[PDB]
């Protein structure tokens, strides 16, 4: 468990590991915006 | 609870496209 002081943040901690893959997906959103020039 | 996780990941998730959207409104350096 997190130390009880940080317990209200358990749900945020639960989702942080997936953020690195969002950067990969973000690159594609970006290239669509510029039309894959 | 799980909605707590889902609202977190929804807000984190929309953060990315928003930067593109804003730089495309402002005609930024995409």
């Amino acid at each position: 468990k997190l130390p009880e002081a940080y317990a209200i943040f358990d749900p945020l901690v639960d989702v942080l590991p997936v953020i690195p893959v969002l950067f990969l997906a973000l690159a594609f959103v970006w290239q669509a915006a510029v039309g894959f020039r | 609870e799980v909605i707590a996780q889902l609202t977190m990941i929804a807000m984190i998730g929309i953060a990315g496209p928003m930067i593109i959207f804003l730089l495309a409104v402002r005609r930024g350096n995409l």
Partner: protein
């Protein structure tokens, strides 16, 4: 000061979210770079201070 600790931590979390969006937008919009580079300078120091604050307050709640 239990509530005060979680206030600094939420402050830190909110500030991070704001600057996660603000810094890339400010960096790529050269129109208002001078207007904005002061704010990223402020937010940056505001951010470091919050880490230190949460860092020391942790030892009074943990």
């Amino acid at each position: 000061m239990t509530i005060l600790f979680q206030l600094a931590l939420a402050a830190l979390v909110i500030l991070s979210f704001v600057m996660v969006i603000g810094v890339p937008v400010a960096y790529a919009s050269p129109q208002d770079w001078d207007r904005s580079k002061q704010l990223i300078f402020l937010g940056s120091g505001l951010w470091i201070a919050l880490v230190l604050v949460v860092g020391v307050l942790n030892f009074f709640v943990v």
